[PDB]
Design a protein around this nucleic acid. Structure first.
Ligand code: MG
Ligand code: MG
Ligand code: MG
Ligand code: MG
Ligand code: MG
Ligand code: MG
Ligand code: MG
Ligand code: MG
Ligand code: MG
Ligand code: MG
Ligand code: MG
Ligand code: MG
Ligand code: MG
Ligand code: MG
Ligand code: MG
Ligand code: MG
Ligand code: MG
Ligand code: MG
Ligand code: MG
Ligand code: MG
Ligand code: MG
Ligand code: MG
Ligand code: ZN
Lengths: 38, 175, 94, 130, 92, 136, 135, 58
RNA sequence: AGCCAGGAUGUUGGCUUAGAAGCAGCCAUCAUUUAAAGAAAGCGUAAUAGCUCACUGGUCGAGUCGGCCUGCGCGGAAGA
RNA sequence: CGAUGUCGGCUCAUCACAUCCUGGGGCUGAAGUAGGUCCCAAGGGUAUGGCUGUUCGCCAUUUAAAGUGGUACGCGAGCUG
């Protein structure tokens, strides 16, 4: 999982979501897309 | 919002009872019951079910649309229901059922044993895919998720427990 | 052609400017040639939107101050150093 | 399409409907680009390049465009009933062409209503001048 | 980062300004403790590592020229692949 | 590496840059960067941002700079007391002017301009804003 | 049903190198297609490619329709050169005449889905311009 | 695109061998440029007399 | 925006390459049928092929969309 | 400053978690023995030796590892020196 400060939307088909106060990006087109902040 | 806007249909001769927010629905198929979210007002006028907010509620129309979707889901459930079929892709991936008890032969030292509620039953016209029908969409989806999370498959070839309409995104292990 | 509602600023000054900026008002002055100097207080976002046009520093506008139209045109400008606020906007009579 | 483009297009269709009387119907409910190509090529060989197969059959477009002439199309506009023009000649044979195209592998969404140009019924007009 | 081995005083017994730059492929290490500022010690250690690897890069050219030299005495006088006869210098 | 050929004197006071600034307006280029706050722009930072803007523009257009590290600051090399006189000359900067355009761009779209100025925000610790040349 | 045309110059039979198995992706034979292509090209000149469309059906009896020679090689022969161009914007290659463009257009007007010859004539003229065969 | 470093040397021979080295180097360069390969001169240490080279690297 | 559909013709543009036919990269990057087609924005192979997307046809339909200034939030934040 | 005993070692450990690592969530340039990893988890292991006036480090054999530290860079009204 990714630990950074500046999280950003990844491509034309990912999805910013809020999950327990942290930004989560997922895109099954790329199993990598699972971002995270903290 | 626009979900609660739309009208809600029910069939004729289907015993639908509202007791405050507790709404049950029973018919030739079966009975689906749940008490609804308190942020919603409900009333029925002789042919329709309407959803709206209650006075002094913030998430009013939102939860009204939520309850609208829920009651349409259970209306469809009591009309015919919702069907799922957990399909396996792999070399010799099989299973079985005994009413609601399932064996899984996917490479363990003990063939896994699975259970389903009284709301779902399975037959086996085939031994690589299981046909299991019911009226509870969320229950059958939970069963799907359980037999999928038992062994979530790999992303490389497509070998494991997947869904009927799903197409595998092939990430081939670069040589 | 913009018709802007503006009033007469009785007392000016720095403290007056600070309280007017608190109460959403920024000044400007009427002048030009030999006429008597009068200065007005403007409607902030209205002026910003109207001067976002390309014709603000070119065309002959019209000012409603104490119930009368005044024909003036742009001459100069001052701006907030580091914020989108026009510190001053200048009028030459037409 | 914005308001000005709509206004010029509506003036264009007003002029076209004023100049031309006869009409025939089609609908691309199951109309493949193969069928569209066949119809456009038949139109190009029969008449000029302005032969069009456009679909302007919306709830507020064709009914509000027709009032200049042939006001009867208030019953035609909605429900996806397309318009195809036939300028040259009186009783051109492009009318039966859309019926034949419907007959050859189509969903029968044209309905061959015919806009009753000769004030005839919704059936085929078998006789045409030759 | 470790302790500068002096005699010594109680402040240098604390200081972890001894910087050791170790090059992991070659294993060559150099230590810098000249200054009590650890940034300057780190910079000096990096510079000394640069210099000292520039004497392992320089003892390879000499080592291969020792191999180029042998070719001078490795010439064999016979079995010619090419022959040039006379000043006309014709190939054969 | 922007740095004076010669300075008036080798050192100078640490200095003050408070209050309001004077580089409010844009002077040379189409697209600029505002810094409302306060800080310092190292010569390395200024050169780096110039190179990065060249990178982004692909050598299309021109770059402009207003503030200069004409003031060789003396910081103190670590582990030296307040005493022993003033410190030693170490590097060069310019400080942050509220309302100042720092780097300028032209010949490329506004989108690329804001991109490159956010990249200036990602090669500088200073607060930013996107500005263009003012009509009179 | 599998409408992919993959053919080469009729002078050489059995185009195994260029496409090969691409023509035999299904279970149909590779000899029958070549025989049919030769039978269609018997009455026309040899040494140029001819496109043929195909809709394979289960009964091993394929239905196909042939077409005219490609307009690319048509304009190639019209210009009398073999290579198109190298960096066409920089340099000039040849001169292309409006009348011969019109005649090249009229010989493939029957193949192309164009009624008014002028539109497809300016189409091929623009093709030549983009390629560097200035009109 | 391959990279080759070749050495031409007189061995332990006299001025005649040095002269032969010079002539062979010239012919080698001419033949290489005819064959279409590029080159650069690295070392051209001289011999003992006029137009006599001891060894060359290519 | 979901929903049924087109998304072509010159064209398989030409190289240099091991084949490059829309996808390894470069050049012109346009002409026609113009409701629509961008020598290609994604997937892919060996070269394709094929599947998409941009864009536009058909429906539910009153609402929809992007810049700003301010109140309070979200994460950056792991001790002996 | 009319005195608050330093480095390392031993017993007891202490506690931190900031995890080295197994035990547990993901990326993978992660197919499976098998590792590169971004991390939760401190209940717990955190070896045995050679060299070293000395935590440091190299080497040999296991193997999860032989953590980074406050404990006045532990603990000397417990030991050593
Ligand atoms: Mg973390
Ligand atoms: Mg004051
Ligand atoms: Mg001493
Ligand atoms: Mg100390
Ligand atoms: Mg100042
Ligand atoms: Mg925050
Ligand atoms: Mg004391
Ligand atoms: Mg005491
Ligand atoms: Mg005491
Ligand atoms: Mg792992
Ligand atoms: Mg943790
Ligand atoms: Mg612990
Ligand atoms: Mg513990
Ligand atoms: Mg604990
Ligand atoms: Mg030991
Ligand atoms: Mg011993
Ligand atoms: Mg400790
Ligand atoms: Mg300590
Ligand atoms: Mg201690
Ligand atoms: Mg004590
Ligand atoms: Mg002691
Ligand atoms: Mg002693
Ligand atoms: Zn994505």
């Amino acid at each position: 999982m990714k630990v950074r400060a500046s999280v950003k939307k990844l491509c034309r088909n990912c999805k910013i979501v809020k999950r327990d106060g942290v930004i989560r990006v997922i895109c099954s087109a790329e199993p990598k897309h699972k971002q995270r902040q903290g | 919002s626009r979900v609660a806007k739309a009208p809600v249909v029910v069939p004729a001769g289907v015993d639908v009872k509202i007791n405050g927010q507790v709404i049950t629905i029973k018919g030739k198929n079966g009975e689906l019951t749940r008490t609804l979210n308190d942020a919603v007002e409900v009333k029925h006028a002789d042919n329709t079910l309407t959803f709206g907010p209650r006075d002094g509620y913030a998430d009013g129309w939102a939860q009204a649309g939520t309850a609208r979707a829920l009651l349409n889901s259970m209306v469809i459930g009591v009309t015919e229901g919702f069907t799922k079929k957990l399909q396996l892709v792999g070399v010799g991936y099989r299973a079985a059922v005994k009413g609601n008890v399932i064996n899984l032969s996917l490479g363990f030292s003990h063939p896994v044993d699975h259970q389903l509620p009284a709301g779902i039953t399975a037959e086996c016209p085939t031994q690589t895919e299981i046909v299991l029908k019911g009226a509870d969409k969320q229950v059958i989806g939970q069963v799907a998720a359980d037999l999928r999370a038992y062994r979530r498959p790999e992303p490389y070839k497509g070998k494991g427990v997947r869904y009927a309409d799903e197409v595998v995104r092939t990430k081939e292990a670069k040589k | 052609m913009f018709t802007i509602n503006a009033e007469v600023r009785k007392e000016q000054g720095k403290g007056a400017s600070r309280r007017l900026r608190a109460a959403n008002k920024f000044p400007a002055i009427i002048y030009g040639g030999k006429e008597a100097p009068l200065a007005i207080e403007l409607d902030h976002d209205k002026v910003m939107n109207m001067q976002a046009k390309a014709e603000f520093y070119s065309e002959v506008l019209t000012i409603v101050v104490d119930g009368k139209e005044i024909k003036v045109k742009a001459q100069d400008v001052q701006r907030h150093p580091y914020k989108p606020k026009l510190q001053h906007i200048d009028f030459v009579r037409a | 399409a914005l308001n000005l483009q709509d206004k010029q297009a509506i003036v264009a269709e007003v002029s076209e409907v004023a100049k031309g009387a006869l009409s025939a119907v089609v609908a691309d409910s199951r109309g493949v680009t193969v069928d569209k190509m066949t119809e456009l090529r038949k139109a190009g060989r029969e008449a000029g390049v302005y032969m069009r197969v456009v679909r302007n059959t919306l709830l507020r477009r064709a009914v509000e465009g027709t009032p200049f002439e042939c006001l009867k199309d208030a019953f035609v506009g909605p429900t996806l009933i397309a318009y195809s023009m036939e300028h040259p000649g009186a009783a051109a044979r492009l009318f039966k062409e859309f019926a034949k195209a419907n007959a050859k592998f189509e969903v029968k969404a044209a309905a061959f209503e015919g806009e009753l140009i000769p004030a005839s019924q919704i059936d085929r007009l078998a006789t045409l001048p030759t | 980062t470790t302790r500068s081995q002096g005699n010594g005083g109680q402040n240098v017994n604390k200081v972890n300004s001894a910087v050791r730059a170790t090059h992991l492929p070659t294993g060559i290490s150099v230590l810098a403790q000249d200054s009590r500022s650890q940034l300057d010690n780190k910079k000096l250690a990096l510079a000394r590592l640069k210099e000292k690897l520039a004497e392992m890069e320089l003892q390879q050219l000499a080592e291969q020229a020792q191999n180029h030299w042998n070719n001078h005495t490795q010439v064999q006088r016979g079995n010619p692949v090419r022959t040039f006869k006379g000043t006309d210098f014709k190939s054969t | 590496m922007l740095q004076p050929k010669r300075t008036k004197f080798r050192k100078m006071h640490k200095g003050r840059n408070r209050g309001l600034a004077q580089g409010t307006d844009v002077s040379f280029g189409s697209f600029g960067l505002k810094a409302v706050g306060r800080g310092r722009l190292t010569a390395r930072q200024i050169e780096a941002a110039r190179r990065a803007m060249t990178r982004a523009v692909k050598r299309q257009g021109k770059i402009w700079i207003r503030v200069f590290p004409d003031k060789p600051i003396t910081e103190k090399p670590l582990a030296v007391r307040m005493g022993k006189g003033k410190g030693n000359v170490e590097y060069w900067v310019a400080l942050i002017q509220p309302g100042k355009v720092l780097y300028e761009m032209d010949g490329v779209p506004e989108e690329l301009a804001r991109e490159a100025f956010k990249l200036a925000a990602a090669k500088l610790p200073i607060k930013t804003t996107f500005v263009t040349k003012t009509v009179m | 049903q599998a409408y992919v045309k993959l053919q080469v110059a009729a002078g050489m039979a059995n185009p195994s190198p260029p496409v090969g198995p691409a023509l035999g992706q299904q279970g149909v034979n590779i000899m029958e297609f070549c025989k049919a292509f030769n039978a269609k090209t018997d009455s026309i000149e040899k040494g140029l490619p001819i496109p043929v469309v195909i809709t394979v059906y289960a009964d091993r009896s394929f239905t196909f329709v042939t077409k005219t020679p490609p307009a690319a090689v048509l304009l190639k022969k019209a210009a009398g050169i073999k290579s198109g161009s190298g960096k066409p914007n920089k340099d000039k290659v040849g001169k292309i005449s409006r009348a011969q463009l019109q005649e090249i257009a009229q010989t493939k007007a029957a193949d192309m889905t164009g009624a008014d010859i002028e539109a497809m004539t300016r189409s091929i003229e623009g093709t030549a311009r983009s390629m560097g065969l200035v009109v | 695109m391959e990279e080759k470093i070749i050495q031409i040397t007189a061995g332990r021979g006299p001025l005649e061998c040095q002269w032969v080295v010079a002539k062979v180097l010239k012919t080698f360069l001419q033949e290489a440029t005819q064959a279409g390969i590029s080159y650069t001169i690295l070392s051209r240490e001289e011999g003992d007399a006029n137009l006599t080279v001891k060894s060359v690297t290519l």
